[PDB]
């Protein structure tokens with residue numbers, strides 16, 4: 450039903466250090482008397498557009514910026530209007546990642562890029578290229594260990610190899626991402642996914658290795674390398690593995706190009722606490738103290754706040770993160786990114802498991818890179834707009850909805866005319 | 874079948890709420906005018 454008025458519900462992904470974020474919520478609570486609740490649901494990036502479509506869910510949603518355009522296209526986020534004095538606190542390229550159709554739709558938090566993590570004790574010199582990993586594995590498998598384990602179930606982790614020699618999502622032409630030009634099944638992406646599949650066929654990796662298996666194997670010293678982001682550093686720190694964070698290996702002499710994500714905090718368009726959330730994000734979280742509380746839980750990476758990024762400039766692991774980010778590409782925020790990730794996830798899974806050939810999986814993924822009817826129905830927008838704070842712009846949304854849907858216009862007339870005779 | 878479950882929620886939303894936002898929508902739709910036609914003929 451109604452989002453609670455007078456408090457803040459926050460949704461953030463389970464690997465992002467929600468406990469540190471909750472600590473800044475408790476400081477917000479002691480300073481204001483407003484309770485802040487941080488939750489971490491499973492399949493968060495899918496649950497939010499489903500519940501917010503009817504005007505439900507959290508006041509603040511945390512995720513990488515690539516999902517937010519589809520959220521904004523479906524009318525699920527409120528426009529972000531920060532002062533010029535606050536826009537100058539964050540780097541402009543972080544603001545660009547959350548700008549959609551000209552309007553800011555989220556607050557940037559931190560910049561995330563995948564890096565090569567390696568055990569310095571097992572591998573004093575990590576490989577510079579993807580090509581030398583098979584020989585490194587047969588050398589390490591002779592002593593029971595293994596070379597590299599990373600999550601193969603999410604295409605986010607295998608995308609750097611796919612894009613390294615020519616793979617891309619949508620081409621950028623004149624400030625507009627070309628929905629028509631998709632580079633999912635070109636020769637560069639074909640050779641990248643083939644190298645990953647070949648290393649499974651040669652038993653250098655298992656097709657079913659996921660996030661938990663890969664992370665535990667590295668933290669237990671079972672594999673010499675892994676591929677992950679900054680949020681994984683603190684779990685490695687408590688494992689006492691002498692690790693290093695360095696540039697990702699090259700493929701065909703080309704640097705692997707990870708998809709750069711900017712962690713961002715959106716505001717629900719149906720939330721009655723839009724002013725409280727702006728106060729929370731600008732004056733409490735986007736501070737040196739606020740980011741330090743989150744970063745100490747799970748590291749953020751290259752934060753958007755200039756002041757704390759200066760304090761965090763001297764980290765070699767953050768320098769390696771920016772290097773891989775500079776070699777990678779910023780993620781598009783267009784609504785079609787939802788269908789892009791779905792298509793590539795199916796191809797990587799159907800090519801790694803042995804189910805389809807690399808060319809058949811990518812060709813099918815090239816076709817499916819288009820969003821299909823994941824837009825709210827005419828019955829949900831009304832419920833969402835009616836469950837949203839009242840304004841002349843919200844009331845006009847209700848009218849244009851009814852004027853285009855007769856049987857909803859009919860239901861509204863019959864239910865309100867009966868109400869109008871209750872008070873005569 | 875969730876469309877009916879939302880039609881159940883839209884129904885109970887309109888019958889219990891009486892906020893002035895919906896009042897503006899009632900008047901903009903001419904609902905008070907259509908009811909005043911019923912109370913004569």
Ligand SMILES: OC[C@H]1O[C@H](O[C@H]2[C@H](O)[C@@H](O)[C@@H](O)O[C@@H]2CO)[C@H](O)[C@@H](O)[C@@H]1O
Pocket residue numbers: 462464494513514515516561603604605606710790
């Ligand atoms: O794999 C598809 C997935 O990639 C990205 O998700 C990342 C996220 O950005 C990171 O912060 C971290 O949580 O790892 C995730 C992958 O498991 C995109 O952000 C997401 O939209 C996309 O579905």
Ligand SMILES: [Zn+2]
Pocket residue numbers: 450451503504505836
């Ligand atoms: Zn609801």
Ligand SMILES: [Zn+2]
Pocket residue numbers: 463488489490491
């Ligand atoms: Zn959880």
